[PDB]
Amino acid sequence: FPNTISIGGLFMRNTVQEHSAFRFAVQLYNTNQNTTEKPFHLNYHVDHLDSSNSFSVTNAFCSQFSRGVYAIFGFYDQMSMNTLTSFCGALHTSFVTPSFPTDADVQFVIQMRPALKGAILSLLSYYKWEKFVYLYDTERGFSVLQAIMEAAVQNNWQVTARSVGNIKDVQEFRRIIEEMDRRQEKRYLIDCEVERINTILEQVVILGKHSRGYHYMLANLGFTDILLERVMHGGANITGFQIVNNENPMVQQFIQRWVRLDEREFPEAKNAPLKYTSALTHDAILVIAEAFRYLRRQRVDVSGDCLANPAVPWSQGIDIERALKMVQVQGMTGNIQFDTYGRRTNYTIDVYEMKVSGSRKAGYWNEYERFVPF
Amino acid sequence: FPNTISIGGLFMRNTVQEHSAFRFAVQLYNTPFHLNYHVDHLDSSNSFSVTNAFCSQFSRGVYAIFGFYDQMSMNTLTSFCGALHTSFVTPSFPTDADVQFVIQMRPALKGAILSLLSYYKWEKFVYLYDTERGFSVLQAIMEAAVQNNWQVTARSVGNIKDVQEFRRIIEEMDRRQEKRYLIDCEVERINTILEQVVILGKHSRGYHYMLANLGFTDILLERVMHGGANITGFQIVNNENPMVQQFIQRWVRLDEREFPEAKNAPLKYTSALTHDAILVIAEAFRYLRRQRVDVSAGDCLAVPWSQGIDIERALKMVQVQGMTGNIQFDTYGRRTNYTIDVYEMKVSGSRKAGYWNEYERFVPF
Ligand SMILES: *[C@@H]1O[C@H](CO)[C@@H](O)[C@H](O)[C@H]1NC(C)=O
Ligand SMILES: *[C@@H]1O[C@H](CO)[C@@H](O)[C@H](O)[C@H]1NC(C)=O
Numbered sequence A: 001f002p003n004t005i006s007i008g009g010l011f012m013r014n015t016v017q018e019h020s021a022f023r024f025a026v027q028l029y030n031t032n033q034n035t036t037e038k039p040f041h042l043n044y045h046v047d048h049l050d051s052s053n054s055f056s057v058t059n060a061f062c063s064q065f066s067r068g069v070y071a072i073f074g075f076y077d078q079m080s081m082n083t084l085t086s087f088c089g090a091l092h093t094s095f096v097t098p099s100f101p102t103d104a105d106v107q108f109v110i111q112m113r114p115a116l117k118g119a120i121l122s123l124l125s126y127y128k129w130e131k132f133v134y135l136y137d138t139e140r141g142f143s144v145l146q147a148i149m150e151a152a153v154q155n156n157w158q159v160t161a162r163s164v165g166n167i168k169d170v171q172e173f174r175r176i177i178e179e180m181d182r183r184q185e186k187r188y189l190i191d192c193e194v195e196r197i198n199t200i201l202e203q204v205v206i207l208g209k210h211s212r213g214y215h216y217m218l219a220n221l222g223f224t225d226i227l228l229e230r231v232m233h234g235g236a237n238i239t240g241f242q243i244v245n246n247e248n249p250m251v252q253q254f255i256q257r258w259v260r261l262d263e264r265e266f267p268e269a270k271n272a273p274l275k276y277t278s279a280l281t282h283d284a285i286l287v288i289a290e291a292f293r294y295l296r297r298q299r300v301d302v303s304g305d306c307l308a309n310p311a312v313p314w315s316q317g318i319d320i321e322r323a324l325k326m327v328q329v330q331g332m333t334g335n336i337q338f339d340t341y342g343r344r345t346n347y348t349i350d351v352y353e354m355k356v357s358g359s360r361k362a363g364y365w366n367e368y369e370r371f372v373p374f
Numbered sequence B: 001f002p003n004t005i006s007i008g009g010l011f012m013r014n015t016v017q018e019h020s021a022f023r024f025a026v027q028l029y030n031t032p033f034h035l036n037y038h039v040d041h042l043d044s045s046n047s048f049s050v051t052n053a054f055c056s057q058f059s060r061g062v063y064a065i066f067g068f069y070d071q072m073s074m075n076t077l078t079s080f081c082g083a084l085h086t087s088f089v090t091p092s093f094p095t096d097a098d099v100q101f102v103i104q105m106r107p108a109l110k111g112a113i114l115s116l117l118s119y120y121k122w123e124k125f126v127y128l129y130d131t132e133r134g135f136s137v138l139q140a141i142m143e144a145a146v147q148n149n150w151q152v153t154a155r156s157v158g159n160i161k162d163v164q165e166f167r168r169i170i171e172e173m174d175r176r177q178e179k180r181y182l183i184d185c186e187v188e189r190i191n192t193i194l195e196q197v198v199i200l201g202k203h204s205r206g207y208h209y210m211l212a213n214l215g216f217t218d219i220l221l222e223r224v225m226h227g228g229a230n231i232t233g234f235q236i237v238n239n240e241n242p243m244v245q246q247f248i249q250r251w252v253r254l255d256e257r258e259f260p261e262a263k264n265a266p267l268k269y270t271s272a273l274t275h276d277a278i279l280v281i282a283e284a285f286r287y288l289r290r291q292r293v294d295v296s297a298g299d300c301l302a303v304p305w306s307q308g309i310d311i312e313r314a315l316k317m318v319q320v321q322g323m324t325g326n327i328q329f330d331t332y333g334r335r336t337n338y339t340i341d342v343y344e345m346k347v348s349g350s351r352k353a354g355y356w357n358e359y360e361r362f363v364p365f
């Protein structure tokens, strides 16, 4: 078994804090000092990529693959996801990612980020929403959208659904709200990127009269980076979701070390709160470390060109993929386990409610117990 | 400008007749550039064989790919075309979301369905659906039910695997006094439902079935029609169109060994769209030649990229009259300015009850 295990890191725009977390988590692994916990050294090579440019993506990918990385940690968005996941699959290279989990059932992709679909439906059922607005963009896939629409027609809900991902003129957000008023809409499910939730909540405020008696369910694990203070001061109900428990001892010990870090070597550590994707980035290193300690323990002998059409041995990379998907470890995002398609399984999503009465953790959700209120 | 234009053909399960229509439409065009193609068959049950199919076609160096997707292979196939700038031309269901580099031969059906629910003043009905043609119709029904305060009882039936279970759903709907059905399912599944409607008895007279599927001519609705039920269907092929008759006349005369499904089954509308795709392709490449764009190979992961923009634009710019009527596309590759014919079959008889287009909406005769 090699002394050093090298991995790739594919980063994009606006993954600066995650890149620092990736660097800090790898460092933490390397320091120590425990023979059993650190039986090899973890190296990496990092490329930045412009997802808007396909050659930029395949280029970054081939660079890594052709250095002989044992795995690639990385990000994708809607433009690059298919290229990136399809090539990892064709080349049998394990891709570990905090990005939105793929709609398709795919191989060689370890998805650090848990599905939100189950938790949202359980909560809609809990609140008994049978009439509501659903504002959505498509940056995290079509899985929530399709489940909502099917639930709506099957359950006789009245869902007014509006796509808002292509909106650039913030005025348009205003008009849509006014249009929702004509249907006496008080309840909004917002399935959008954080940045876009922020823009919508700013318009609700600028517009006025859309806080008291309103309820906004924010379908995004990035709950902590959402700016909702002004909406909350107006009387609104807000529901959100998180997978990082600030009371968790592991989250705590990570945070204490993390906020001391220098802003030049680790940008975004001191000037912004820890994004949940930075926690998922940390936990990815735990998963990788654990997978590879396992392979080492089994005396596995870990074994081309960046080309699709020419072949690829069937059993290649299978050993690593399995080792990654069989891990059960406790991280900053709780219990971490994967199913055969690399999806988080047996995970917990914490549910938060903000009301004029105050702000609190209102329960938790898991696949077996569904929503448990507290 | 090359004399020979090469295209790929990506064929699936249950596209035999379309494959024969493809080969024949190309032959007709060839018998001034010449059309070559290479076929790959595809299994969509893996996100893997899909990537493999597209990559093989891509490495041959084709100028466009004619082919099919299903709900499973759709995102991966169309995404590859968009990323590698290779135009995909297809009779498959039009994509729910706006995509680039996908020319969709098949027009949206939702406008026509809504226009007709209004014409009939349906306010309470059953909505049976599978998701094999996307969510576009389902979403438009959801929206319209809210907008007009409809009382829609909706059941998903795509996953039903025992035909007996369809009788059970129909009975439940009887307890709700349902007489009006909107069926948004594959043709095969529609045939199964109508067979269960018949077997059940007493569900013809008094009932009205609106069949949301452009494969109207493949629906077996004779027994149901003899019982007194109302049926409404939709088509995009006019069998009285000279061009359709001329194609058919030569097509039924092909030997069954080389052209399977021409003699033992009526032309599917998807086979007509397949013929129309060759029309669109031939016209697009006449444009590019006229523009003096030169179109004269590597691996998926390695200029024919730079030309893709122009090919895609030529395709989407064409206007041609085909077996499916006027053919034009918008910036997202969706049919535009198309006509849908509406057929109703009553106890009084069967007839084209009018046509629907985006501007006039439904125009009864
Ligand atoms: C907001 O929460 C309150 C407190 O439970 C609830 O009773 C009310 O119905 C909610 N508002 C809306 C619009 O649902
Ligand atoms: C899920 O995780 C819990 C807590 O980590 C663990 O004890 C249990 O083994 C897991 N359950 C299943 C069903 O895998």
Ligand SMILES: *[C@@H]1O[C@H](CO)[C@@H](O)[C@H](O)[C@H]1NC(C)=O
Binding pocket: B179, B180, B206, B207, B208, B230, B346
């Ligand atoms: C069927 O057809 C006639 C129109 O000729 C119509 O009035 C009747 O209401 C329709 N039947 C049903 C069940 O809706």
